[model samples]
Target: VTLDDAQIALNGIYRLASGHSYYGDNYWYYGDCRAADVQARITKGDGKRVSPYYEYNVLASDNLNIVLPWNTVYKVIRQTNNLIQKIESGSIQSSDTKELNRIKSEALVMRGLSLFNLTRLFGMPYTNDKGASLGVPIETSPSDPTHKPSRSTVAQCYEQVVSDMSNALSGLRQETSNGYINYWAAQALLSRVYLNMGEYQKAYDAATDVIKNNGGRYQLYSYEEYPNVWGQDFQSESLFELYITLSEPSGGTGGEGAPMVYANEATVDWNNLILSEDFLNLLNEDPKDVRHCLTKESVIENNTGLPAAAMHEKVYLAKFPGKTGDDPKTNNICIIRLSEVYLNAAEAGLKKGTDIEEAQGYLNDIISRRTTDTSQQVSTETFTLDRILKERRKELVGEGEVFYDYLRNGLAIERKGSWHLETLKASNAQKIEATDLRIALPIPQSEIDANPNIQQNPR
Candidate 1:
């Protein structure tokens, strides 16, 4: 294998990561839909079900949404493993070792990211029993065709994830283009991992490292620039994003990703997901909050309304509004960004308890830019973990991390809104307790059928 071959393999891995089942669509919304910030408009008998996540009744047999992400994430892991082996075994010929290191580092980070996503989606929350619960299998070799590996403990998987990212750090340069994962991107992801593991000191340190030593390569968008940044490629705020130049293969769905379902109001048939009423109310805390600019109103007539009104107005999200004049599915999916880094620092620093004021400052930086109203800013006297989490709910709603915030923090999902009856009723509970087994999605039945050693989560 030549250096050119390694680059080509790395590019293939990135493209696969953006496939419809992964970042291109379902992976982005699963967290929000499960967490109740996003609701499915059609899960009943009357209409086509967009997804089964909202109902929290996803069976192991549900193949379309439940099985596809698991399949694709493992596919990515396999691809990265092949690339990593080729480089480390001296099979890839390269004159510049630094560039080869960068290429290998990219593959390492991608593998870590793939594992992290799998564990978060399929495994129980890491904080639950300190990750003693079952997590997805950790695959790291290219020649494991007959392995049929058993599930690893969540703690074991997390330990591997941290090892991969930490090993990749020195091999990675300080900065790379937005489309690729660089040093800061790896660090940002580590902070997210550490935060979820409840390692407050490490999370705080990793986040502060990015905020202080990124060489000013990234800056937060202003209120006016916030809404404008969505659906555009290579924005300064993005640290790592999947670049989509054209629509992905549709999988018979016409290539619609998050943008078509979340941002496009006209695709009412499949635009079945919208912001929850509770979430909308939370955003309404300050009318001038720039985050409000991402939502649009849509009116749909349906029978199950509170009073059977002729038409009910639903708030549609435009955060993933497809690139202007391009196909609706063509969008660069953001995996990590600057704002999340700041929020991570705030949450972790506050929990660390040694530098509460610094944590407050980090929280204020995000809150102050979001709204011009000084009253909306959080001060040290009023600062709390809830304050940081609420800011996370507002800032990271569409990005799919809000639900993890709840899961990692051990907070019950306060289910509300008329749609609660439409969907959450499937779970037979108004508020989903953090400890509920349903929090971890069932492993796909096909996986169980194929791998005899694998264990499925409680259904």
Candidate 2:
């Protein structure tokens, strides 16, 4: 491709990547948004008040609605394919060979990562039926002029993703770049994928590789500095981030801010989402814990006329603090992080039943930094896999990992002082089945319309 065409293709890829965080929150927090009457999950509420019942119907139907990410991923792949096609045609400039190859490798990994995350969320677990189960369609090469591509089996789609990531790894640079994908980033993401697939050994290996080699790129911010870590720029632990700026303004399509989802009475922004009481209570259970300061009572002024409430008591997630400018927007969205890798290694090691001490070590490393104080040292010997998960919940709050943790571990959604079933039943709402079809989002309506071979997720 000519330089102009290549630049255009790169721009498209950037846009696709930029939209991921918003899209992901949409899918994962569908129930939360529904519960709060806003477009995001509130941090403060009891189980009965939360949106989306914990049942099979909600989960099954949820899978069908997973079209946003699907569309965005294919858009990125199409752009990458165009670049590859042009390169193959000998029309593109070759002077910047290293740069070109690096970009290509990044695109390949990103495509694979996107597909892998989609499969994990929308398709059944890999253990269910690797190949026969339907997966989102795989569109590797440029689309055919006359024939629509058919959806591939889950196993086939996963294999393709793994293959792409493997190929991408060979060309990806090991050093960190300005929020771009690198070898370490790819490795970290691979670990995440493997962990989700229940491939503990592979996950552990990938995470260990990063910990042993690329650990210098990230370190936990001190507890005193933690509140500011997410404020303006990216944090020390961030591996791959989507950079937003006040000048460029990565604001939501309708001028919504990232904090819009969590805003309540204390902030000047719109008030809607709040922290769940159960989560807040967990941190408060330890009165002297420094983590309690992460969440506080606040009064916010907004047009909604709703009273301020005690919200986000455990972690305020100050990572995306608004920028100070004519048009404010913070540049913070983590695709991968060192802490996640650490947690992945810890969990994978535990599950595999090998190197239990090593697993505990990883967990302790994070806790020592976050929980170190006069009150507690977080003994590694007493730490269980569940404790690790809880630590993740506290540390990664508002990063959109909690709900997934519950779903993946088959843990019940816990709201303070209320059971999900009782709340729904009291409301005379439709009974939600735990095994409902909504667990996997529906394939995008657009994709199905465009490709006859694509099958709708079974309802």
Candidate 3:
């Protein structure tokens, strides 16, 4: 492997890894937003109208739920798989062996993460029937135009994901780099995967490794700078992120977070795609909390398109204000942050039900930086799964971690208020049963049409 080969390969790897970003016409437009839909389900909010999401009424073949994420993730996985085989087989030779290893390692991680996402989205929770249940087709070999694989078991998918990332860890470097996947990024993603699998000890170890190895470089921002967590790109706190570059060609809809949520400068009122009542209440409970530093009360009366509300509380999510003064596109998409590590550690400790004091300390550490007031902090004696989940509710909202959290814990989403299922206003709807098959998305009809080997999930 030569230095030239590594650099050239790195370019493709960067594109493959960032394919899932909220960039131009990318997965976030549909895929990531769908993940957020799960969050929007359990949330009661001031808004009168809503969008398409999970609910009791959603059909098994719902377009948004099935096609968007499945198509996007598998397409990316295909690219990564083809690239990985080329690198592993040394077909693309490089003089710098170590640099080439870096490229291959990143490719493997991208492949692993994309499959992991597909498995959870289309398969069962690892907590339930880890061995027997179908996960997703584990496509490892190089591209074959006629080839298609069947879904692997949940346990098999996780094992393969772990293997890919573990091979990546030693080769990935923490040396200053943005948008590119590295050792720290791989470790952080592993922590997330481990947590999802309910492997407490492994999650704790992976998360803690990132914390300790960063050498005081990866600390959370102060309350004053909390908004920068989303506002800026490549900060010390961000473990891994996608740098949205609008000047060049993009995945599509460059960084769909703000645009998909808020349409324009005049669209200030919290009318279209706003925050949840459940989330707002959590923020309102702590006036001293810095999470709301980005929020602002609605004033102007503008056309929010759909039905108007009757004197409701409205606060536009000023959180994702354009980094370039309404540049309308391009703001870094954060994949993982160090704060997640602390939270992961705390939750893992709780999952293991050991080191009672140490786990509480990790929880408090996050609270201390997030809020200005000391008395608002939670105590260890009162710490419970509900409390941790509540904290996660506020901390990780809109970033798209909610519905998966509910599924991973095997807890039903008991939400009330006007909800969305194809934006049809289902009253007190989509309050999901823990055992609902729809919790795992139906494999796309197109896939079934294409591959007879791949059996769709339960309807």
Candidate 4:
């Protein structure tokens, strides 16, 4: 293929890694929706027991599974691998080497990210006894029509992802690159990976590395500018964002519109996912907290004709309103932010019991910005691991971090609704353990059917 062909292939990789179409329609449709449903963020208004609004059964199915996201991820990986192979074989032009290397680095980072998400969703939590359970297939190269690979153990999968991320970090240029993967982005991802793996020190080191290196590159959005940060475009603090233009016709066909916190207009009779009562209560304690004002709010009728109800009592995310006009698509999906690195570093310090003062300083830096009262200040004496977790929840709400937090912390889903859990309890349906097969969705059945070498998680 020519340089143009290779560049086109690289662009395809960018599209795939964007996660707007793949994670939005498939993975989050099952994972994020189910978690939101269980948390009572999205509920059945008709009092239906076990609402099929988001198609949880496909995820809850004992045999059936969905592998489209995995397939899409592999497609991008293959495309990248092909480009790399062609370049190595002297088939591609040398003038485009810089761009190709950058693209290749992005592909590696995306590959690592895809595998991480797959493992988190399909395989057991890292703490489970069967932590080394089988995970999705790892496709490194372009596959032939019949090529298939068996599942790797979860431990092996994470190892591969870490290796890929490390390689991606080395390959990536240190210069700042917004809307694309860069060295800091790779480092941030590594911090996330290490955090999920329960390696607190590594997570801390990686996060600190990003923050220290990119310290001058980005700064936090002021309290006044917070609303505009997610209004319609990318912000300075955003490490990486998926650019969605108004003209591009992309995203899922379901009631959901793009990968955002809002609910579909047709699926649920609500404006957006409701904030958890606990989350709202937290904000209420400190009315002056900027996050409380930015995220939480009582229900209002901005969109005409919707039934009047108690929306987010004191918390509502104003992030990512679908762009105005016929082809709504100006919003860019945020992948990582600088604020998270600070939070991660604080958590890591608490876990490692190193530099408690420094950890508290970082935590206080964020909290101080949110709170107006000096009396309610957080300090080294007041900081605890649980508090750090709660702070993270407050900071990262509706950004798709809750479910993972629960999993990592080994917290059970507190069923606060009158649906599936209640019905199951009433009908004497065998109580599914909080930590059961259902927690992590099974690999998509189509994958098992098509790839003989691939194994399915035991139902």
Top-lDDT candidate index: 1
Question: Which structure among the candidates has the greatest TM-score?
Answer: 1
* Model 1, global lDDT: 0.80
Please provide TM-scores, in order, for all candidate models, with all chains considered together: 0.94, 0.81, 0.87, 0.83
| Model 4 bad stretches (over 4 Å) | 2-4, 19-21, 25-57, 60-65, 250-255, 259-272, 295-316, 323-328, 417-434
Q: Per-prediction RMSD in angstroms?
A: 2.7, 5.0, 4.2, 4.5
Instruction: Predict model 2's lDDT versus the native.
Output: 0.59
lDDT of 2 by residue, 288-314 (tens): 554555564444323233223432122
Candidate 3, residues 352-427, lDDT tens digits: the string is 8887688788788788888878875668767787777777766765555666667677787753323233232443
Give a tens-digit lDDT track for model 4, residues 1-459: 666776677676766665433543344334333443223343343222122222233342232134455566666667767766676677675577776676677777877887887787778777564357777677676666576778888788888899888987767878777567889888887887787777889998898888777758877767676655564555677887666664442542223433343533333343335444455566677777777545534334353322233332433455555554222234566777877878888888887898788888878767776677776656777788777876776777655555665666666544343222233344232233336666656676677667788777765
lDDT of each: 0.80, 0.59, 0.64, 0.61
Residue 421 of candidate 3: its Cα lDDT?
Answer: 30
Clashes of 3: 15
lDDT of model 3 at position 165: 90
lDDT of 4: 0.61
Off by over 4 Å in 1: 44-50, 247-256, 299-314, 325-327
Ranking by TM-score: 1, 3, 4, 2
Weakest 10 consecutive residues of candidate 2 by summed lDDT: 34-43
- 1 or 4: which has the higher lDDT? 1
Cα lDDT of model 1 by residue, 231-291, tens digit: 7887888989877765344331234477677644433545656777788888887788998
Q: Model 4, 290: alpha-carbon shift in Å?
A: 1.2
